[PDB]
UniProtKB/Swiss-Prot annotation, chain B:
InterPro entries tied to this protein: Calycin (IPR012674), Lipocalin (IPR002345), Lipocalin_CS (IPR022272), Lipocln_cytosolic_FA-bd_dom (IPR000566), OBP-like (IPR002448)
Subcellular location: Secreted
PANTHER family linked: LIPOCALIN (PTHR11430), ODORANT-BINDING PROTEIN 1A-RELATED (PTHR11430:SF65)
Record-level GO cellular component terms: extracellular space
Species the sequence originates in: Bos taurus
Chief location bin: secreted
Gene Ontology BP annotations: sensory perception of smell
Entry function: This protein binds a wide variety of chemical odorants.
Family in the record: Belongs to the calycin superfamily. Lipocalin family.
Superkingdom assignment: Eukaryota
Keywords per UniProt: Olfaction, Secreted, Sensory transduction, Transport
Protein name as catalogued: Odorant-binding protein
Length: 155, 158
């Protein structure tokens, strides 16, 4: 029985959107800029930044987008994406993230958003069980596909 | 003569995703292969002894949503029809992971052995309550919240 030491950087990895709510429905409608499907998040304690990787549809086409946010002394984060944004983490753990985002667009219109995201956790012993099983059946390592990374880097 | 297995897998139902899939025959999991399956959801029914699989596959340029129902056997294994006959065995399971071994026999009698690792997307009640309270605090109407876990308008992994 052992567990990895908790470090903010240990929260980095694949994350997925569960729910997103908005005071302005147009922002999260089909082709809305905030109807974002999360791919991965990278937390950096030393630089005080969070990098967001997500996908969103625009002009009927899916786009891969990266946004870097910077921590403020008040602990909140600022990011530029379809206007200015102030992002606040309401609850966080090894498995979930609940946040509140304030957006002011290029016309001075304000929208407040709430979101629930969850982390996809892959443990070491489970990976080991899969690999031992795979060699037991005589399957070559080049004969296995990583589905998780394909979803994290769609097109 | 082993004894009976007390099986309560009902609470493992929910959204699950594919992590890895290995195969003795590479053509089955390559692009356009019938076994390059992106899992979406698993529903276990302890009373009927079944498992329903919901997943997506791309067959010749188009994306397909597939539903497969499997049935347990005295054996402890499950059988299902999908691109042939299949015998599925759960080798390791827990609230978050499933490691399985599947044997497929296609229409030409060819036997393929596959291994797989799948992980569960677990959404806790404590966190769901926190989100709904916050949502209410900001005056957002429930009609204005989008569910991203069960939504047909999603991105393609390939």
């Amino acid at each position: 029985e052992e567990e990895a030491e908790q470090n903010l950087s240990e929260l980095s990895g694949p994350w997925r959107t569960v729910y997103i709510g908005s005071t302005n429905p147009e922002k999260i409608q089909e082709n809305g800029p905030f109807r974002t499907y999360f791919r991965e998040l990278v937390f950096d304690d030393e630089k005080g930044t969070v990098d967001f990787y997500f996908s969103v549809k625009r002009d009927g086409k899916w786009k891969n987008v990266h946004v870097k946010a910077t921590k403020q002394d008040d602990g909140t984060y600022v990011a530029d994406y379809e206007g200015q944004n102030v992002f606040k983490i309401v609850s966080l753990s090894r498995t979930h993230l609940v946040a509140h985002n304030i957006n002011v667009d290029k016309h001075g219109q304000t929208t407040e958003l709430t979101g629930l995201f969850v982390k996809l956790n892959v443990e070491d012993e489970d990976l080991e069980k899969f690999w031992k099983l795979t060699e037991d059946k005589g399957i070559d390592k080049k004969n296995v596909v990583n589905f998780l990374e394909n979803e994290d880097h769609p097109h």
